[PDB]
């Protein structure tokens, strides 16, 4: 079995938001529903990560660390892919029953939070990213940040990350290209991977502010509330090394 075929079989199933479309829309209502959906998607992301070849061989503490750092990049990247596959238009497909269409984008403060996620689906469409490249890229996003002091199984992590970089290369070679076009493709895709750090920085700014300001009455499920409570002091103390492919 090829490695990308093993990343393929563990793709999470499609989750529904449980969004009642008979009731009118509001930014608060959509944000609340998406936070509850995000918690369920994160629980599914943990089950997904545990099935990635090599991940369960890392120290349990490193498994927790990597999931705590990358959760938002995994969410935004999986959302970008689902949006890119469902429409050729500017729509965020959070769930089949909750798509942020052009009318929903006009809701107060909806666009400013949606725009960073729209960048992901725009880039995947502009770069015409394949299913195999996406799978390798999403696994690389789980391995895109480490603590500034490193991991307990750092040597093993460096070996695993290298293996999935090699996998991305193999997926690229399949796209009917020559050495010069494949050099351009690897560069373009690793640039999109690099840009995910800036996408996440912007989404986490909204996330952390919305979570800390209790007067907004924005509910976060236990799974997200726990990750956010862990992540805020780590960003505060500079405890993060964001891995980059380019400088």
């Amino acid at each position: 079995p090829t490695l990308v075929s093993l990343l393929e079989v563990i793709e999470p199933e499609v989750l529904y938001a449980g969004y009642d479309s008979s009731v009118p829309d509001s930014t608060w209502r959509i944000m609340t529903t998406l936070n509850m959906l995000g918690g369920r998607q994160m629980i599914a992301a943990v089950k997904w990560a545990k099935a990635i070849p090599g991940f369960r061989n890392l120290h349990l503490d490193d498994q927790m660390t990597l999931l705590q750092y990358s959760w938002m990049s995994l969410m935004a990247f999986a959302l970008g892919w689902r949006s890119y596959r469902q429409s050729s238009a500017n729509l965020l497909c959070f769930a089949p029953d909750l798509i942020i269409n052009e009318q929903r984008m006009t809701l107060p403060d909806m666009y400013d939070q949606c725009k960073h996620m729209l960048y992901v689906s725009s880039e995947l469409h502009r770069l015409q990213v394949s299913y195999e490249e996406y799978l390798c890229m999403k696994t690389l996003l789980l391995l895109s940040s480490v603590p500034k002091d490193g991991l307990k199984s750092q040597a093993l992590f460096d070996e695993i990350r290298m293996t999935y970089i090699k996998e991305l290369g193999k997926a690229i070679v399949k796209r009917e290209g020559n050495s010069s076009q494949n050099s351009q493709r690897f560069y373009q895709l690793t640039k999109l991977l690099d840009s995910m750090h800036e996408v996440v920085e912007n989404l986490l700014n909204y996330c952390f502010q919305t979570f800390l300001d209790k007067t907004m009455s924005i509910e976060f499920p236990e799974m997200l509330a726990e990750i956010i409570t862990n992540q805020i002091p780590k960003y505060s103390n500079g405890n993060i090394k964001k891995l980059l492919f380019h400088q």
Binding site: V46, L67, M223, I227
Partner: peptide, 13 residues
Amino acid sequence: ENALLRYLLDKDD
């Protein structure tokens, strides 16, 4: 500290 995440990683799927 991160009780839920630890449980999901520790439990058998």
